[PDB]
Design a protein around this ligand. Structure first.
Ligand SMILES: Cc1cc2nc3c(=O)[nH]c(=O)nc-3n(C[C@H](O)[C@H](O)[C@H](O)COP(=O)(O)O)c2cc1C
Ligand code: SF4
Ligand code: SF4
Ligand code: SF4
Ligand code: FES
Ligand code: FES
Lengths: 258, 428, 210, 39, 87
């Protein structure tokens, strides 16, 4: 019924047309790495970390954007895919700051976890890094912009969900950076999800600044009372004190936002 | 057979040095717009067949079969317009041909845009030209006005029921905007940032509509190809390298110039029979960047005993590219040359792709150090691995073009780097 | 340079800039070149026209272009910072930009840049006190064959030399304006000394027809 | 024979847009998307 | 964005008083089952264990995300609103 037979490490899958390699791997259970992809935002091909290998194909494709054709077989733990991931992580961490002990995105860092799993264990980068001027864009969101890995999740979230169109990329090349060309403030009813969406600690929450670390928190699952929607929420405590509040996926109410 | 020694009657681009006129009258006296009405009325399929049988290949970047590329858009209408887009953006170093074309033979370009639009069933032809070419674009627009007024363009194109709109569009100083999709985005008003393919412009291109991209040279030769049959063009090169070609010869040559010769022409004959010959002699030469700066380099030992065409240059590992020869000699620092050339790419990168973004600058730094010799040989293989990391894990081909030169240099001039390093070690 | 704006008395939304009437008409004619909807495709030409009204782009001009095209000003700041032909710092009267890419470099654009720095007394990047010349180093431009070259405002001057560029700069320093093109005998791009082709005449309106 | 392309020695900044304006009258009705903008 | 933690069911308890020590300010308790978390591969096994031991249990369902239609081409349409303003 308009379905297609695809292969993931040899195993057959039924998928609808227009479906992507990443989505097929997920339907099998496998999970491709990500920095620029998010189910609820537009698609971009910037991070170059979702790259996998197709049987009988010289070039690696992007799983976030390439719709799966019939008959393809996808090799996820292949030498080519793994070398691509290693190189991309090498490049990402080339110009990253060594701020992990100051970064409140410390025990929650997708970059950390993916460097440990799919990345190498040492650096061949013996050159000088770069540094960026830190913006001020509100009382809630703290910006250390020398940690941005230029994934565009913030820009896309703003343009699409929050309908703001005030974040963007000014410049080009490594000299490029993200934010507003001016001292504008980003104060929306939804400003605060850029924090959960930024894979790194470039955007953080000023209230939660420096108060705790993830492996300390006990997490209970509750709901909002501020409004009459009932947004599903997580309350993260530490030694009997409430430290922060997080969303919790309920795709029929709030779908990862609060 | 043999090749070279092309005749001024088999040449296509007359007025190449502006010794004749470039206006409507001169183009008429040279042959432009002759029988174009019948070329049209024949139908698109006829024209696509001519393209195919001509063995023509893209003259911008990587030569791709124009017949197949244009037939990709030979289709019905899903309810949208369909466009043609000529990338006059000519920013690749060593290339100065599209400028001469646009400022001397603009009527040929107009006619080629019309013919390609008919071949595709299109409606309008946008021409995206560098913003530094102001006078050239002004002359081009003067010619477009001449056409609009005469009646060769617009509603009744040349005596048929085909309506066609030719528009000119300017850039703002970016090399990446030569890319198929970056150009499209810049026209749409966004930044010069490419797209991932698929989708291909044949399906979702400019404004979301089917747009076919092409080059000045290709579109401007299309009409002569059509009115000469294809079997003429075809009979000047190897089975697949058929056609004439524009070669921009510069570097350490006595008389740098821009020439039109037969394909598969030995680079040595191209340097001697034209161009005034290398400076200092044939033995002072050191190496060549044949097909533009993006392409890697080949040394004298290959520059001799070699042809000039996509195949038989692939073998020497330096694709033909834009046919922009940059000659060098024994009085140079190839490391400094290619390092400045990589700094070019570091400045012209757009930004989004991680490998390109964060690695072209890495490589620029490494090469700036290699010049002095502030390194150790163990970094050369690391440079190789980094270039290979960048090559195929990008979006566009700018990373590929920035990687290939380093590969060529490390492959053909490693001892010079090692000696520079040892000399730095000596004079700490 | 910098891709961030701090409001100064010389640059701010209160800075005065509006579009002239004839330029409003030109803007209308430009927008009529793009479909109904998808009219944000004029940002580049409109920004260039604002540069030509005043040779540099202020935040006020950006906001005005945004108000005109109904496009948010972020999608104008992006373009203005991405494309290098835009001047967000006030340029002088003549914007010399010398190609220092490998071809012109090995054909010794370095020496002409030295000549120019010495003459004008100012080094790359900065402008003259009288605000007459602004000097820059730049990448390829489309004159690699006539490699040693410059671009001042919209004109090219090719195959120049120390003496030739000094003469051109003296003519510009006077109230006089020179004529563009190669300054080394050759006309546009032909081989030095003459031609290696096009020695014969062309064919009439009809030939090779089939 | 001598050089001919000597028309650009007198062009001016607003030339290109003046001519684009002159041609706006010759242009043909562009198509439409049924929308003022993507909003 | 990792999902290797939403794959095994877990059983925990209700939380109780957690007060402050006067001496040093630490977190003191009397419930010895506050840090008790058990892992299972099946709700049926979890509930069987709960019944076996004699605990009144609440159960939640596995909130799985929906399949989504993604089209990189939708960001460049000629007629729709999905068109994106920044690439
Ligand atoms: C960095 C970069 C620069 C490019 N520059 C040009 C160019 O200046 N001219 C051009 O025709 N194509 C350029 N291309 C590739 C174009 O996509 C290609 O030449 C064009 O689409 C083919 O047109 P054709 O049908 O005439 O062969 C460039 C590609 C990249 C990645
Ligand atoms: S985002 Fe923070 S925790 Fe993650 S690698 Fe960067 S500095 Fe370290
Ligand atoms: S600030 Fe965060 S979310 Fe925004 S582009 Fe940078 S890494 Fe991505
Ligand atoms: S490879 Fe470089 S220039 Fe090309 S799209 Fe990616 S970031 Fe831009
Ligand atoms: S997840 Fe595919 S490029 Fe980022
Ligand atoms: S290298 Fe200088 S004009 Fe091209």
């Amino acid at each position: 019924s308009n379905l297609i037979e695809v292969f993931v490490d040899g195993q057959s899958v039924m998928v609808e047309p227009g479906t992507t390699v990443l989505q097929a791997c997920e339907k099998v259970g496998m999970q491709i790495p990500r920095f620029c992809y998010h189910e609820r935002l537009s698609v971009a091909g910037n991070c170059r970390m979702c790259l996998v290998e197709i049987e009988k194909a010289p070039k690696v494709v992007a799983a976030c954007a390439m719709p799966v054709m019939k008959g393809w077989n996808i090799l996820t733990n292949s030498e080519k895919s793994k070398k691509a991931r290693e190189g991309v992580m090498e490049f990402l961490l080339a110009n990253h700051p060594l701020d992990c002990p100051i970064c409140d995105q410390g025990g929650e860092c997708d970059l950390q976890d993916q460097s440990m799993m799919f990345g190498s264990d040492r650096s061949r980068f013996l050159e000088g890094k770069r540094a960026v001027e830190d913006k001020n864009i509100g009382p809630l969101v703290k910006t250390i912009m020398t940690r941005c890995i230029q994934c565009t999740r913030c820009i896309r979230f703003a343009s699409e969900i929050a309908g703001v169109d005030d974040l963007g990329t000014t410049g080009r090349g490594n000299d490029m950076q993200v934010g507003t060309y001016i001292e504008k403030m980003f104060m929306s009813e939804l400003s605060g999800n850029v924090i959960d969406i930024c894979p790194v600690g470039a955007l953080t929450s000023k209230p939660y600044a420096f108060t705790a670390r993830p492996w300390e928190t006990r997490k209970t699952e509750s709901i909002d009372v501020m409004d009459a929607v009932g947004s599903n929420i997580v309350v993260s405590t530490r030694t009997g004190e409430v430290m922060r509040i997080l969303p919790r996926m309920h795709e029929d109410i709030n779908e990862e936002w609060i | 057979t043999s090749f070279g020694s092309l005749k001024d009657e088999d040449r296509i681009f007359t007025n190449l040095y502006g010794r004749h006129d470039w206006r409507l009258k001169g183009a008429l006296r040279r042959g432009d717009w002759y029988k174009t009405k019948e070329i049209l009325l024949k139908g698109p399929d006829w024209i696509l067949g001519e393209m195919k049988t001509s063995g023509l290949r893209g003259r911008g970047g990587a030569g791709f079969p124009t017949g197949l590329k244009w037939s990709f858009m030979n289709k019905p209408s899903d309810g949208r317009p369909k466009y043609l887009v000529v990338n006059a953006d000519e920013g690749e170093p060593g290339t100065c041909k599209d400028r001469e074309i646009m400022r001397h033979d603009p009527h040929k370009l107009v006619e080629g845009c019309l013919v390609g639009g008919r071949a595709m069933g299109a409606r309008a032809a946008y021409i995206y030209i560098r913003g530094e070419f102001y006078n050239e674009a002004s002359n081009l627009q003067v010619a477009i006005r001449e056409a609009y007024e005469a009646g060769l363009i617009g509603k009744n194109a040349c005596g048929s029921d085909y309506d066609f709109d030719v528009f000119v569009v300017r850039g703002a100083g970016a090399y990446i905007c030569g890319e198929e999709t970056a150009l499209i985005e810049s026209i749409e008003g966004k930044q010069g940032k490419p797209r991932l393919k698929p989708p291909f412009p044949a399906d979702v291109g400019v404004f979301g509509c089917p747009t076919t991209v092409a080059n000045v040279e290709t579109v401007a030769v299309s009409p002569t190809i059509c009115r000469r049959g294809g079997t003429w063009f075809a009979g000047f090169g190897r089975e697949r390298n058929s056609g004439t070609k524009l070669f921009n010869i510069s570097g350490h040559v006595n008389h740098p110039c821009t020439v039109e010769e037969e394909m598969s022409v030995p680079l040595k004959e191209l340097i001697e029979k034209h161009a005034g010959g290398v400076t200092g002699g044939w033995d002072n030469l050191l190496a060549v960047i044949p097909g533009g700066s993006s392409t890697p380099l080949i040394p004298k030992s290959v520059c001799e005993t070699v042809l000039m065409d996509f195949d038989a240059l692939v073998q020497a590992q330096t694709g033909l590219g834009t046919a922009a020869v940059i000659v060098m000699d024994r009085s140079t620092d190839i490391v400094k040359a290619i390092a400045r050339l990589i700094e070019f790419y570091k400045h012209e990168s757009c930004g989004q792709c991680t490998p390109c973004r964060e690695g072209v600058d890495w490589m620029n730094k490494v090469m700036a150090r290699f010049v002095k010799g502030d390194a150790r040989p163990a970094e050369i293989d690391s440079l190789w691995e980094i270039s290979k990391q960048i090559e195929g894990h990008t979006i566009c081909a700018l990373g590929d073009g920035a990687a290939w030169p380093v590969q060529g240099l490390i492959r053909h001039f490693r001892p010079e780097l090692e000696d520079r390093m040892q000399r730095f070690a000596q004079q700490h | 340079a910098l891709f961030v704006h701090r409001d100064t008395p010389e640059n701010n939304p209160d800075t005065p800039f509006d579009f002239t009437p004839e330029n409003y008409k030109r803007i209308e004619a430009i927008v009529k070149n793009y479909p109904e909807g998808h009219q944000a495709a004029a940002v580049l030409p409109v920004l260039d026209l604002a540069q030509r009204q005043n040779g540099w782009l202020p935040i006020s001009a950006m906001n005005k272009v945004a108000e005109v095209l109904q496009v948010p000003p972020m999608r104008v700041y992006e373009v203005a910072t991405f494309y290098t032909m835009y001047n967000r710092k006030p340029v002088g009267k003549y914007h010399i930009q010398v190609c220092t890419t490998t071809p012109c470099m090995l054909r010794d654009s370095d020496s002409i840049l030295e000549t120019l720095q010495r003459k004008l007394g100012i080094k790359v990047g900065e402008t003259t006190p009288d605000k007459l010349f602004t000097l820059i180093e730049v990448e390829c431009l489309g004159a690699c064959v006539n490699a040693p070259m410059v671009q001042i405002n919209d004109n090219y001057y090719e195959d120049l030399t120390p003496k030739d560029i000094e003469e051109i700069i003296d003519e510009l320093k006077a109230g006089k304006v020179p004529k563009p093109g190669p300054r080394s005998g050759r006309f546009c791009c032909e081989p030095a000394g003459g031609l290696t082709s096009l020695t014969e005449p062309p064919k009439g309106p009809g030939f090779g027809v089939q | 024979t001598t050089y001919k392309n000597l028309q650009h020695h007198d062009y001016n900044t607003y030339t290109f847009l003046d001519l684009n304006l002159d041609l706006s009258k010759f242009r043909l009705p562009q198509p439409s998307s049924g929308r003022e903008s993507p909003r | 964005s990792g999902v290797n933690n939403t794959k095994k069911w877990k059983m925990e308890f209700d939380t109780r008083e957690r007060w402050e020590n006067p001496l040093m300010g630490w977190a003191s308790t009397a419930d010895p089952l506050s840090n008790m978390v058990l892992t299972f591969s099946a709700k049926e096994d979890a509930i069987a264990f709960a019944e076996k031991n004699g605990w009144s249990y609440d159960v939640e369902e596995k909130k799985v995300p929906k399949p989504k239609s993604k089209s990189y081409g939708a960001n460049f349409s000629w007629n729709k609103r999905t068109r994106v303003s920044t690439k």
